[PDB]
Amino acid sequence: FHLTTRNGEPHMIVSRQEKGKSLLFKTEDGVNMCTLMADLGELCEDTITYKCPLLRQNEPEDIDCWCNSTSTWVTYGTCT
């Protein structure tokens, strides 16, 4: 995935071949591990973009993306 930013915050452009794998990227505050559980398809015009909240010792609820060290934005296409 391509690591960029959105208003100072880290942003992940996730491609199709990353479905099912732990997303890791270094940050001043250590290594960040986001988990993507998404309709994740091929990167195209039909993108969706939203935030993966920070979750410390809390079970996830009503979400398919979350990181454990620093909240991150994520973007991926839905095409197939």
Add this chain to the structure above:
Amino acid sequence: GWGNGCGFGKGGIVTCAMFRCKKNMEGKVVQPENLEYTIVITPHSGEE
């Protein structure tokens, strides 16, 4: 979803089964023509 191999939501599924008829019935159309009448013509002789 994650529990069955997907990266959650509705997915497309399709199922097929070979269909083998074991007993059938058939309806036919009877044309007035092609009807065949059998008539017996017997000589009134009284012979035995």
